[PDB]
Design a binder for this molecule. Structure first.
Ligand SMILES: *Cc1c(COP(=O)(O)O)cnc(C)c1O
Ligand SMILES: *Cc1c(COP(=O)(O)O)cnc(C)c1O
Ligand SMILES: O=C(O)CCCC(=O)O
Lengths: 438, 438
């Protein structure tokens, strides 16, 4: 038996079974809220349905004619089932008038804490705000230094900059796009207070070694897990874990929201206080901290969150199926040394699907795929943090050289992958990818 | 001929006309979105309805016996008609998948811009965020001093403190609870860069004099108008006007939102950039400012705002009626010398109703209305900015004494006032207040 908890490791186990590679594995599903859709869709009397065809039942394969591919059409991220359920919960929340704090905010924090196996959760107004509050709660002061990679979304460095701290950029691992633990200790000075690893594209960093370093220098760890919800054993070594529930993440609400996650009650208390004006917990208009933000989640978005999180494990399952299909159908382009593919691992939730186009062919392939084959691809993110055309960069990061980050930035390309894409759509992408690499 | 544009002055004129003070005045209504409910309820064929009974048609007065009064029951602040329209609009927005930016954000900014007669509006994720971003856009750096009053909600000073600037408190005048223009000049230094007047409780500060002072020293003015939507001529003299649409304000959404309002195109662009990660507008992932926040309004809350703002002018008219009835019915306590009441003025939108309990009986009155008469009263706000139990206040605001502010703080008490309260409920408050002073 394996008991599907809704995390990446179990989903990868379930996928190989749904394709039949299992050894008569008894699967059962935990009835937690992130499994709600999966349990309705694939299970029947707490056992896998006998009659599951992935292509027909899960992806609705019907040989539809495809003429163009967009990378992330927003209208396909939400399903009619989601919408009907959201309307239902809004009709319950709206009459209450509780539109700031509320019971749905607290229910979502309980759900997230259970899902992540962490004691304390502060649901926030965005992942960016969660990070800012979290930096403040560990005691970050203006001029303090925060070690971080240079290839994240701008929010990561912005949270550090917004409170007057100093990003110190460290090179990545070319094997995982994650910050390299072997280069972290070199960057530690008297001014560093925090290491800020990013679980980029849905894959986790090598957190075990970072913790060992963090303990020797007595540094805090705040993990940017804004793209990594559902990854197994997420946050085992972190002081604080940051989540984002923006509508584009593996799990989103209908608007902006995020969360702070921790087992450390002292940090949890300060985060709750900083996220709401410095007021003592649930003592509005009475400050104990010097200041704070207006950064807790909306009760209404928490209620939408509790409806949409029902689809999380199922949508992550569709994501891992799509990623494996890309890997298996592009392998010969890798054997020809034209591209490098990601490897299937049990922690990746496949928020984004990166490949590397080597021999300097990335720009030609991206541009031809769009201009010739009507296929959008994207580069997350087009500019590295030490390379923005800002006054901050020109004064502080001109001499920054991040060898692996910069090299892989010239090769990276992200392929369309979202849980409601058709297999005919992925076929379109796959054939363009193959045709342009003849 | 009086043209009702949905603002303060005309509402006071209309109220005088709707009562026995009419002067055969002809009223017309402008079909703007904030007038929607007003026009539907009080007008017919584009003329004022003939036999409007304020108590019976607007408040449904039936002498229902009341046993208890809550200060601000959140369930009573939103109507079923609003809920219906919200459900209706969300069935249209939700299928678009457009949950961050979107067309409703843009429409709400046009609507607010028209209503305030200002060229540029950036809809934000909160009033607090709007204030922080505006301060950034005028160039506030760490160390710049911001002249404020000390009697505002924490957010006003928190926005200054959050970006490293230093608030410079200035006393109020005893007449309006607003910053005393007489004392602005006293506090101006080489380091002052902005004056931050607060239109507290819905009453406008004497802005014409503040503009005079600010121009002598070439200072920007940022108006915290988070309590004052609908006040006539709002922002005539300020560089930027901060609005809040939090759900307990005269107009609110069903979550957090705000707006930045300006005629200055250069500030609006910077506000737009600081509002979304420092990115150039419509060119994401390419930064032009050093950093930014994630603080634009959610498209979903903008759709909601466009539904709820239909009630604003009508809900402000119920507020003024309530205010006047408290005034006329409590003056027996004013003539006695036990209390002091606000004066009806054309600019007050009556977000809160303040009175002053004289000669040190405020605490006993407040506590006996609750234990003896089950009447909730509240103090907005319980702690002054310079007296909080924070490390800031003792290290910073220890020699700081603000005479009229602190003395008024011992007298102040707010009476329940919200546009859906019953007159039976207000009469219950009035009998408790007279009884407790017999
Ligand atoms: C999206 C994202 C963020 C910010 O999350 P928001 O909820 O949009 O503010 C931070 N870090 C990473 C890696 C992200 O992908
Ligand atoms: C409510 C309020 C704020 C903050 O507004 P939010 O939208 O809640 O962030 C700021 N100033 C005053 C005077 C307020 O009443
Ligand atoms: O912060 C809040 O939720 C309340 C502010 C608005 C008000 O009640 O005056």
């Amino acid at each position: 038996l394996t008991t599907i908890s809704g995390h990446s490791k179990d989903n990868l186990a379930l996928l190989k079974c749904l394709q039949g590679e299992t050894k008569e594995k008894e699967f059962e599903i935990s009835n937690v809220l992130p499994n709600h859709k999966m349990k309705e869709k694939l299970f029947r009397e707490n056992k896998l349905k006998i009659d599951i065809d992935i292509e027909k039942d899960i992806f609705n394969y019907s040989r539809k004619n495809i003429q163009k591919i967009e990378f992330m059409p927003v209208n396909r991220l939400i399903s009619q089932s989601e919408i009907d359920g959201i309307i239902g919960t809004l009709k319950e929340v709206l009459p209450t008038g509780q539109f700031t704090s509320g019971p749905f905010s607290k229910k979502l924090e309980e759900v997230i804490g259970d899902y992540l196996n962490k004691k304390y959760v502060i649901a926030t107004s965005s992942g960016t705000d969660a990070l800012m509050v979290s930096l403040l709660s560990i005691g970050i002061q203006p001029g303090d230094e925060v070690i971080m990679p240079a290839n994240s979304f701008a929010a990561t460095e912005n949270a550090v900059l917004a409170i007057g701290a100093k990003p110190v950029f460290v090179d990545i691992d070319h094997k995982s796009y994650c910050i390299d633990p072997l280069k972290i200790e070199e960057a530690i000075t008297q001014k560093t207070k925090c290491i800020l690893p990013v679980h980029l594209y849905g894959k986790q960093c090598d957190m075990k070694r970072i913790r060992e370093i963090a303990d020797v220098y007595q540094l805090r760890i705040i993990e940017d897990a804004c793209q990594a919800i559902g990854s197994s054993n997420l946050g085992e070594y972190g002081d604080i874990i940051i989540l984002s529930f923006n509508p584009y993440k593996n799990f989103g609400v209908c608007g902006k929201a995020g969360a702070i996650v921790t087992n450390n009650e002292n940090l949890a208390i300060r985060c709750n206080q900083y996220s709401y004006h410095g007021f003592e917990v649930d003592k509005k208009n009475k400050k104990v901290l010097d200041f704070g933000f207006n950064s807790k989640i909306d009760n209404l978005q928490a209620a939408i969150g509790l409806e949409r999180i029902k689809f999380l494990s199922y949508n992550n399952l569709k994501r891992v199926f799509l990623a494996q299909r890309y890997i298996r159908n592009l392998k010969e382009l890798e054997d020809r040394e034209l591209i490098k593919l990601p490897r299937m691992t049990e922690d990746n939730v496949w928020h984004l699907f990166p490949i590397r186009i080597i021999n300097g062919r990335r720009d030609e392939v991206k541009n031809k795929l769009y201009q010739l084959y009507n296929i959008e691809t994207d580069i997350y993110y087009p500019v590295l943090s030490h390379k923005h055309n800002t006054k901050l960069v020109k004064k502080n990061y001109m001499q920054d050289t991040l060898l692996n980050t910069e090299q892989v930035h010239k090769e990276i390309l992200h392929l369309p992958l979202h849980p409601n894409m058709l297999l005919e759509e992925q076929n379109f992408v796959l054939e363009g990818l193959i045709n342009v690499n003849k």
